[PDB]
Structure formats: C-alpha cells, structure tokens
C-alpha cells in the first residue's frame, strides 16, 4: 500500500539500464506527491535517490520486504544521466489502472466535477483557512457528483478515504485512476469546520479525438441520429485549415450515411486515403476533402 | 458532388484548366457544360455573371499595388474591398478587407469607373475616403 510510504523509507530499484541486464540499485524516499513534469498528466510521483537511468522505465520500486511500492517512470537529468532524482508511479495508482485494463482494455475515467487550484499559504490567509496545503474548490459543476454530495465552492479538501492530501494535483491523480462509480469519501474544510462527504464517480468533444491529429474543433451528436454537428471552432487550427466551421452538420462521409459519431468513426476505421465529408452549412450542402 | 467532364463539347483536362477557360470568357457568355452525376451524363446551358466577391485585383486600378481584391458595392455605394493579402503593397498603406471607398480627392466615388476617373487625373498624392465599420477614415498615397 503506497499510502503507507513515508519520506525516509528505504527503496530498491530494479530495471534494465542501457540494456545491461537486470540491475539493482538502492536509495530512500526523497519526497512524495511530486508532480509538474507534465501538467496534463495524472502524476503523484514518489521521488527517490535510487539510481535510475535509461532502461529502468517500467521497472519495479520495492521496499525492504520486496513489495512493489511504485513503478519507476522518469528522472530529472540535464545530461541524460542519473543525478539522484528519480520518480515512480505509486503502487496504488498502478493497482487501480491495471485492474481496469484487465477487464475493459482501457480505463473508465470518472470525475467529481469540481474546479480548483493549489492551496498555498497566501490563499489560506485570504480565505481565513488554517491548512497551508490541499485542494481549493473554485467551483462545483451543476449536476455533478460533488454538487449532489453537498460540496460548495470555497471549500478545502484535506483528505481522501482517510488518507491526507498532499495537493490538488495529487488528488486529481488519485481519482483520475479510479473507475467510474467508485464510492469514496472526502474530508473537507469550510469555515474552519471539519466536514465528511460520501461521493460516487460519474461519467465525463474535440475533433482530435476522432481524426487523431485534427485539433481546434469541438463536435457532438445532433438530436437523434441527425448527424454530427460542430459545436465550436478555434482559429489557426488544423481543422479550420480544411474549411470546417462551427454550425456544420455532417450528414455522411465517402457515400456512407452518418447519423452519429459511431457511424463516422466506422468510416475512419476503414482508413481511406481521402476523406470526403458531406456536411451542410445553413441551407446548402457542401463537401470537405481530407488528404 | 457533380463532376464536370466537358466544356462546349471540348473535354476537360482538369479543374485548373476549366478555371482558366471560363476565367478568360466575357461576362454573359453563354456556354454549355458536360456533367457526370451518379454515373449519368448531363448537359447544361449556362451564362457567365457579374462576380459579387473577389471581382477585381487592385493592381488593375493602381498599376502597381497588389495584394487586395475589390469590386463595386450594391448600387453605386462605392468600391468595397473583398480580400487583402498580407505582406503586400496594398496593406502597406493600411488597406484592409471590408473597407468601402466613398470618395477620393474630394470627388465622390460610386463605382470603379468614378474611381478610375480620378486616377486618370494622375494627382501627386491620392487621398481615399474609405469607411471601416461606422467610422470614416482616409488613406494617403505617394
């Protein structure tokens, strides 16, 4: 259980550096809940001074009892050589992520539906809050699990399932690995009062998700099998470079009728050299060509 | 979704060729096209019209100022600028798409003929009284 890890605990790394072969190195837990290497990724890193280099990735980080505590992922090195700063993904996050892949082949990503940021000492002063660290709730989305739970903005999350929270970024990573419908409990702090709440993860689009490389255009289904309407378009993007504009409604592609995103994706699965979209702007019917 | 195959009987090599063909024909020229829709041969009678947008380049009127297309606007409502290219002699003096030339050198301008009429005078400096949005401005030349 990676949640029992404490800075100071001894760690042992096992991997294949430079293809030399199974190589074992040792160290200690430098720090926990490290993140920021890639703001878009779910990262709650364990940091260790245990030697890790090119090849160790996917390797095991274990404690003195040989139990897996994390998976060595990246290092901070200006020269491409270890300098005593390595990061590993906590065993718990792996436990959660793999168990899903085993069953679904992917991860059912759920959310609480809350906006927020890191609670620093400055922000604590303004909000008359005691804790100098945690998740500060900017706002709660309507019809979200959190809303239903009774979470209000200006709240500070301090714990998750009993385990204290290092930061907002950590909490994001925690729940970011849990399967949809997972029942969990949060420790909140509003007006210097401790609160406990029971939650349950819920379900939670861009054009890059369907064309694999075409960004700057959001789109979704239209009514009931009326095609794929484009919600919004950004300027200076790969999508608008082919003509695409917000308000268009994709009727079909390559002589195949398109009622929803599933049918559209089924034409792309065929992987044709050139894609011909039969969209409709206002009263007119037009075509858009790709490749 | 139609495919044009012939022009006035003569087969079409490419879209680019067709573009060049008609691009040289005078307005109102009556011509016929050979279409192909649903594996079905179609014939149609057409007549070239007055292009509302991208009607005329600017180098054709200022003799040396490229990168800006413009045409007449509605009914003697001035010369509106259709489109402007970046890094061109035109935009170098300020000209931007959407502008509507009301007059030049204190002479009213209703259409391209009137405008060219002022340029025939060949003044040392040209002062265009254009209008962007609800504002009225001037653009100076030379």
């Amino acid at each position: 259980d990676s949640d029992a890890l404490r800075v100071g605990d001894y760690t042992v790394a096992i991997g294949n550096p430079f293809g030399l072969g199974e190589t074992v190195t040792s160290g200690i837990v430098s720090a926990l809940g490290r993140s920021g290497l890639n703001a878009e990724n779910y990262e709650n890193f364990i940091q260790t001074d245990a030697a890790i280099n090119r090849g160790n990735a996917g390797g095991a980080l274990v404690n003195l009892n040989g139990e897996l505590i994390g998976i060595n992922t990246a290092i901070l090195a200006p020269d491409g050589g270890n300098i005593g700063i390595g990061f590993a993904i906590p065993s718990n996050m792996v436990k959660n992520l793999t168990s899903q892949m085993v069953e679904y082949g992917q991860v059912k990503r759920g959310e609480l539906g809350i906006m927020g940021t890191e609670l620093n000492s400055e922000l604590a002063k303004a909000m008359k809050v005691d804790a100098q660290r945690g998740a500060f709730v900017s706002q709660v989305l309507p019809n979200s699990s959190a809303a239903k739970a009774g979470i209000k903005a200006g709240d500070v999350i301090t714990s998750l399932n009993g385990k204290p929270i290092s930061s907002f970024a950590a909490l994001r990573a925690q729940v970011g690995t849990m399967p949809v419908g997972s029942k969990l409990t949060l420790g909140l702090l509003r007006d210097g009062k401790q609160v406990n709440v029971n939650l349950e993860l819920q379900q939670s689009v861009d054009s890059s998700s369907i064309f694999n490389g075409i960004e700057g255009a959001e789109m979704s289904n239209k009514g009931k099998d009326q095609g794929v309407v484009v919600n919004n378009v950004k300027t200076g993007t790969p999508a608008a470079q082919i003509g695409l504009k917000k308000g268009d409604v994709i009727i079909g592609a390559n002589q195949q009728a398109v009622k929803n995103i599933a049918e559209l994706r089924k034409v792309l699965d065929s992987k044709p050299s050139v894609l011909a979209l039969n969209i409709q702007r206002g009263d007119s019917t037009i075509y858009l060509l790709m490749q | 979704g139609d495919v044009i195959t012939s022009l006035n009987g003569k087969p079409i090599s490419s879209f680019a060729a067709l573009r060049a063909q008609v691009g040289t024909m005078p307005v109102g020229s009556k011509l016929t096209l050979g279409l192909l829709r649903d594996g079905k041969q179609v014939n149609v009678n057409l007549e070239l019209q007055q292009s509302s947008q991208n009607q005329v380049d600017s180098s054709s009127i200022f003799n040396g100022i490229e990168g800006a297309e413009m045409s007449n606007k509605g009914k003697d409502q001035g010369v509106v600028v259709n489109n402007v290219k970046t890094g061109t002699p035109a935009a170098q003096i300020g000209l931007k798409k959407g502008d509507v030339i009301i007059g030049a050198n204190q002479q009213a301008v209703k259409n391209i003929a009137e405008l060219r009429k002022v340029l025939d005078s060949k003044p040392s400096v040209l002062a265009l009284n254009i209008q962007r949005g609800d504002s009225t401005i001037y653009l100076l030349m030379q």
């Binding site: 003509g243 060509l289 | 879209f15 680019a16 067709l18 573009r19 008609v22 691009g23 991208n54």
Partner: peptide
C-alpha cells in the same frame, strides 16, 4: 523550379 521568362473558385 518554374520561373518567368485547396478548393478553388470557378
């Protein structure tokens, strides 16, 4: 290349 001596609109 060539030297002097996208949907287009027709």
């Amino acid at each position: 290349w060539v030297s002097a001596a996208g949907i287009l609109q027709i």
